Design a protein around this ligand. Structure first.
Ligand SMILES: O=C1c2ccccc2C(=O)c2c1cc(S(=O)(=O)N1CCC[C@@H](C(=O)O)C1)c(O)c2O
Ligand SMILES: O=C1c2ccccc2C(=O)c2c1cc(S(=O)(=O)N1CCC[C@@H](C(=O)O)C1)c(O)c2O
Ligand SMILES: O=C1c2ccccc2C(=O)c2c1cc(S(=O)(=O)N1CCC[C@@H](C(=O)O)C1)c(O)c2O
Ligand SMILES: O=P(O)(O)OC[C@H]1O[C@](O)(COP(=O)(O)O)[C@@H](O)[C@@H]1O
Ligand SMILES: O=P(O)(O)OC[C@H]1O[C@](O)(COP(=O)(O)O)[C@@H](O)[C@@H]1O
Ligand SMILES: O=P(O)(O)OC[C@H]1O[C@](O)(COP(=O)(O)O)[C@@H](O)[C@@H]1O
Ligand SMILES: O=P(O)(O)OC[C@H]1O[C@](O)(COP(=O)(O)O)[C@@H](O)[C@@H]1O
Ligand SMILES: O=C([O-])C(=O)[O-]
Ligand SMILES: O=C([O-])C(=O)[O-]
Ligand SMILES: O=C([O-])C(=O)[O-]
Ligand SMILES: O=C([O-])C(=O)[O-]
Ligand SMILES: [K+]
Ligand SMILES: [K+]
Ligand SMILES: [K+]
Ligand SMILES: [K+]
Ligand SMILES: [Mg+2]
Ligand SMILES: [Mg+2]
Ligand SMILES: [Mg+2]
Ligand SMILES: [Mg+2]
Lengths: 436, 425, 419, 424
């Protein structure tokens, strides 16, 4: 009680009853579980991104606007089905629905476009259809590739080569779907931007009762590496035909978030099912409850103990910023980023504070949805003559957007993360600011 | 041997942090220990036949649930008779015989304020037919438990009352309900309709954590393998749900439609068995034992004191089993609350206690049928030897293993006070 | 590796002790300040220069003995010895002057204490060690006796009896810090209980983030012998391991035959003991127990100490007017030296009360642009650090500054690569 | 119940703290020690402490081990000191409440290897039935093998405590500890052989490694040095004694303080008083957790029974752990886990009763009743003897819980049983 007494008097007892804060202050994981309360309402914005598969049930512009409002952050196009013409029309409809909210940063919501490959099939490596689909992805400006059946590091090098010189910025998320992918996980993660636990094929390739071990191991290793991990397949399966999920399905979504997944996915639930919008809404509601139930006290301690020492100033600033945010219950960490990297390094420490990433790159704003707790703000103003003024203006844009969108309130403390010179790679400053 | 330390997720078990423990989980590290989380199967048309019940007992069913919301007293009396016939068909091999508990799940109060008249009649039927456990529906407060206990009468004092928490009031008054109950059931079906569906996992984790702290059994129930009512294999969310209920700390997991009315009752039991075994090896005992000891209050009860000493000793030598003599099951329950990796082999003469201890994780009941020896010390020894011989036959023990043996200083319940380290010959 | 780094990486406190190595040489600068009592054996300017070189950070004047004229001459000699090194601003070492009161005797605040406290204000003393503090009102009386001109003087309450120990929380609340005055404490309470009072008071001061001094008979045999006993070296090392911000010498420097050697011995033991601190547990416990705060100086301090540990920073350079921003960094016990750049000569002297704070008195011409003036004070911290052996080219440092001039606005932490 | 007063004594509020920092903050000068003093006191016997009357006062003050320093005196002089110690010890055999075994330890003069004088002094020790040898200047494992060989055919049961006194002994510590029964941190010579400011590092390291190995460690030299001429010690001296106990030392020692000083009895009394306060201040919650985590898994039933017994004693705040032992080994394995409960060791071996003073928290009871024909009755008689002596000495009262450690058959090496008994 003495460690939270002054802040309880200042912020109030109602503040410390919400977002599972009594469970968050527990001294053991067992006590943390005992203190979880169904009446402790989540307050923070939902941090785990939702990937929705686009298909016949979720293709129209009107339906896509509803899905964006329900919480869809990434639109997945499964190239195992449909044609290039079909998927190009789906991409155009996603972009039209996204741009319908472009009138202001308060309404605008970047949505990433991910291409999920058909896979190698019976062949030992990159198929000819995958080469054509990957070229289609580059030509249509996709942000992410979910590479099917990645079994070794050379599979991801082949996907990278097939994206060519114009697709260097596309994120490659390797799908682990069989025994070989699980056994060679370390070499695959090393060369990938992230991982997808593709439980559909994994549950057929290895005994079904072992999938949870592979999921927990891969999520843990991605969390340790600071790289995005997606939990996928049959999360809310019964919602393909029913308006409400089973007890096992809500438990599965909550446990994927508690395991440490950066993203959760919907496949048949959004692509063909009768309730695509409701499936997104259900994942949104469960993820916010589960994020508040994360035991940050142990998680942050373990991420520090396991992470090696670093001489990279972005990494050093990120841990100092997350430590400062926890000390004052900061409402947000505002970070300036060109490629999304400074926001990714804050996200790896799993702050409770929202990471508001201010960027001029439309592609980086879409791709940062892969990192838990990163809320992208696309800045469109032309650069100021004095660089320091341009930096200040972007921070103020973050603060004003934050207040207008309810993330920030007068009296809140925010942590601001910036660098000492222009260009990517120079983040080295952390500032504590009081919102007025 | 090196092979010993590669099995049962032992590299993950030796990790210094929970994060590193997760990173070290290996799909090729095979489970070796016997499955410790009990399986409750609901009895219905898909699982009433004596021959089908024998297959369910072989697949791993430990408790048969009778849902009194369906069928007459004559229907439930026939269910009980068929379960007893299937169970007793294996009694000719005493070293391998598996006791099976019979649990009566009540209809509940309905729109009524407390114990309904139909529940009074069903509870009296349960006492007259010798049921072991009552799963009391919609328990909202301590007085609901007292009413169930009063309705069981003087002949039903030994029946365990597991309170089902199915609504907001039951969750809010959980502490007072747990205090007077023998255990709890997280009845997720009604709970997921009474409170927002997205909050059920919080109530499940909280109740399992509190029951683990109290050392009382907790059952996770409803829709765990729902798709197996019609499909031969479960969904990815269903296998995950079963594994996470075990990792959360549930003593028992349950099947409802999957065994009462579905096409795959035996396969549903086999699936829960396979997942539970994998998940039990993935438990991070280093943190769990540390937290259970730290949170458990000091005690002057010799059974409790001997139990923590025995569990600590079992971990020190990687004991294959803790063999305990018990009259009521209490000495085995107090060992189980510390979650040893060693199997707790409970030797008892009480057929009812042998059935009821299935409520406690990691307790393997052995019903001893031999008449007492004239010398009490020789009777205790023969029971310990029966535990060892059953253990060897069932694969729990081998020559060279170390076992912890827990006994008491005089006959009768309540006098457990001795822990002994024994080498299997 | 050096500075007990194998013991520092251990997973348990037991394994940390098992890995302590007599051949692992200390590399960090000595963090625990040394307070030396000035008397007949340590009064001359020449002797005081040798004591400053040996490591004396605070000069204590015991008003239980001598006269106002005697102590004024001691103060003048300390100031002359200190200023003899002012010609090299990158290496100059400030030395605080502390006045230790006679006490209440058989009485609250005595009339002699009122006169001695007035003498302290008139002679610009930095600290008062208030004898026999037994309640919060004793501290208020000392503060009132210092008057309007003595508002900046630090009051370190000396706990010397049972009542002071029992009312410790109320005394610490209103004091700037505490002295565990073991001489009187060991006569007022059973001698075998003094270690419990010492460990409890050091622990509570560490929790409060306030300075604590361990005092009396630490190297007693060195009053007549050139080398201390085995118990004396152990006592000094254990006071540092307990968490003391300062260690003190009384008769050892005031009247003994080896005042310089006594200071050298405390310096050598403290350096060895500081490397043997188990920071892995200490930082985790200090971080867990320090309350949540909305004060930006407090928030920046924990972020800076966390960042320093992440990169093995050689130093945390902090700009401070009153010493407060450096004190808030010191409370988290970083392994990195806290180099405090200040223009206040008094703050530079007083900040010796906080473990791991190395004060640098800035006497360079001002810059017209405030951002440039801040930058030049940071470069001064770096150049003094390189000259003194704290920093080398290639090291990483954490820099702590504020958003506008004046005390109370520290809110920035920056990661900087040296040279 | 135990009462609120019970939980205010023996630093129990500090014992229940969740962190080491909180534990320090909760230490209370008004929380009185209740447990018997567990750290043994070794007193050096010389001119100031040689008479039978003076030795009786030193035994009453708390001396557990009498050290005879063969760097001085002669064989005839030390034989008379041994005879006087034995006469003073046996003067209390008429009262069960005051009879206490006292070990006799021979400290060698020291050395290229084993000196001719050490061979003769070690032979004198065997002939006079000494319990322990403090071997001076042990630098390597072969030095211990030479001492062990010199202990001839009759002295293989004598405990060899290696004195670490120089840089080489510190650097080769692991190999020395492996072959020794225990260690002495001989700070006098160590503080001359290595820089004085590094001695505390060698002391803390050696105490930590001995605690991890489950072997006795003695802290020695200048602990209460000023008491050679003064009636009261300095503040640094009381701190040094308390910190040696908090570091994990099994024994603390007095040299010139008892051998030639003006206040030998007062020096023993001061060590007794400080050790009792310091033992209550030990943070058992972390200590037990770390000893358990660092100790390897074991298939030895004595080791397995010992950890189970210590865990059980902490669970019920047991007043004592009563153990039957012939060699002292079962008591030593309980002692390595540092229980707060007193370890009452009931033995028929007078030698083991004297030697177990090397292990912290072991209170030996020498049992001399003729053996019962039924072995289970002989075990029950010894257990009841431990209980009745415990009630007579103030360790136990009716209603207390005790943990009892025995084996399944007679003979040393078979301890495998832990029982919880309610005192009647
Ligand atoms: O129905 C269409 C469709 C029809 C006509 C043109 C394009 C599509 C289409 O693109 C599509 C569909 C459905 C799904 S699904 O419901 O998720 N699907 C269910 C069975 C096959 C599974 C698999 O990929 O192995 C997943 C998709 O993942 C998907 O991308
Ligand atoms: O001898 C002088 C002296 C002689 C002539 C003029 C000034 C002084 C003097 O200022 C002084 C002395 C000695 C000490 S002491 O050795 O540390 N110590 C000895 C007695 C016990 C302690 C006490 O006050 O309770 C003091 C002092 O602390 C101290 O400041
Ligand atoms: O005075 C006698 C004495 C006189 C006449 C006959 C026997 C003795 C004697 O046996 C003795 C003495 C003194 C000590 S001491 O004061 O502890 N001392 C400290 C200095 C160096 C140490 C050394 O081991 O070399 C010895 C002893 O340790 C010690 O055992
Ligand atoms: O996260 P990234 O890709 O490293 O971008 C961070 C960069 O953004 C900045 O804050 C602002 O840079 P720009 O003015 O070029 O946008 C830099 O100081 C910093 O290096
Ligand atoms: O677990 P419970 O019900 O307390 O039973 C433990 C009892 O079992 C025993 O080991 C054997 O008793 P019985 O010979 O009466 O079966 C007793 O010594 C002990 O009190
Ligand atoms: O530690 P203190 O007393 O609060 O001083 C810190 C202050 O020093 C500064 O860094 C520099 O201030 P000045 O330029 O006035 O010296 C301020 O920005 C900050 O508020
Ligand atoms: O500690 P030690 O020397 O192994 O002695 C322990 C032995 O003491 C006993 O408890 C009693 O044995 P005895 O009857 O031979 O004395 C044995 O069962 C056990 O093996
Ligand atoms: O490919 C997938 O997404 C799968 O198999 O789950
Ligand atoms: O009653 C039940 O089992 C339920 O509602 O889940
Ligand atoms: O006044 C003091 O310094 C003392 O008594 O220790
Ligand atoms: O021999 C000893 O005891 C010493 O040197 O400390
Ligand atoms: K695909
Ligand atoms: K029912
Ligand atoms: K004074
Ligand atoms: K000697
Ligand atoms: Mg697939
Ligand atoms: Mg229900
Ligand atoms: Mg004093
Ligand atoms: Mg010596």
């Amino acid at each position: 009680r003495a460690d939270v007494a002054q802040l309880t008097q200042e912020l109030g007892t109602a503040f410390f009853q919400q977002q599972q804060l009594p469970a968050a202050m527990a001294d053991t994981f067992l006590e943390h579980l005992c203190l979880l309360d169904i009446d402790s309402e989540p307050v923070a914005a939902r941090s785990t991104s939702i990937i929705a598969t686009i298909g016949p049930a979720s293709r129209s512009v009107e339906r896509l606007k509803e899905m964006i409002k329900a919480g869809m952050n990434i639109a997945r196009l499964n190239f195992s089905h449909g044609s290039h013409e079909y998927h190009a029309e789906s991409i155009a409809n996603v972009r039209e629905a996204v741009e319908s909210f472009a009138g202001s940063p308060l309404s605008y919501r970047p949505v990433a476009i991910a291409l999920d490959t058909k896979g190698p099939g019976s062949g030992p490596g990159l198929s000819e259809q995958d080469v054509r689909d990957l070229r289609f992805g580059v030509e249509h400006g996709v942000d992410i590739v979910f590479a099917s059946f990645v079994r070794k590091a050379s599979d991801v090098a082949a996907v990278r080569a097939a994206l060519g010189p114009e697709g260097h910025g596309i994120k490659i998320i390797s799908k682990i779907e069989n025994h070989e992918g699980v056994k060679r996980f370390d070499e695959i993660l090393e060369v990938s931007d992230g991982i997808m636990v593709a439980r559909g094929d994994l549950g057929i390739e290895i005994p079904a009762e072992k999938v949870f071990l592979a999921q927990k191991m891969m999520i843990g290793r991605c969390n340790l590496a600071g790289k995005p991990v997606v939990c996928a397949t049959q999360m809310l399966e019964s919602m393909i035909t029913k308006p409400r999920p089973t007890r096992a399905e809500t438990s599965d979504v909550a446990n994927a978030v508690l395991d440490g997944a950066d993203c959760i996915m919907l496949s048949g639930e959004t692509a063909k099912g009768n309730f695509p919008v409701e499936a997104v809404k259900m994942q949104h509601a469960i993820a916010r409850e589960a994020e508040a139930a994360v035991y940050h006290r142990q998680l942050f301690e373990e991420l520090r103990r396991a992470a090696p020492l670093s001489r990279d100033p972005t990494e050093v600033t990120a841990i100092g910023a997350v430590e400062a945010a926890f000390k004052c219950c900061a409402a947000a960490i505002i970070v300036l980023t060109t490629t999304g990297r400074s926001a990714q390094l804050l996200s790896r420490y799993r702050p409770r504070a929202a990471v508001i990433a201010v960027t001029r790159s439309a592609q980086a704003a879409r791709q940062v949805h892969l990192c838990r707790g990163v809320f992208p703000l696309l800045y469109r103003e032309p650069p100021e003559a004095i660089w320091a003024d341009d930096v200040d203006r972007r921070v103020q844009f973050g603060i004003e957007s934050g207040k207008l969108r309810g993330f920030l309130r007068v009296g809140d403390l925010v942590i601001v993360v910036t660098g000492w010179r222009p260009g990517s790679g120079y983040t080295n400053i952390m500032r504590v600011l009081s919102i007025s």
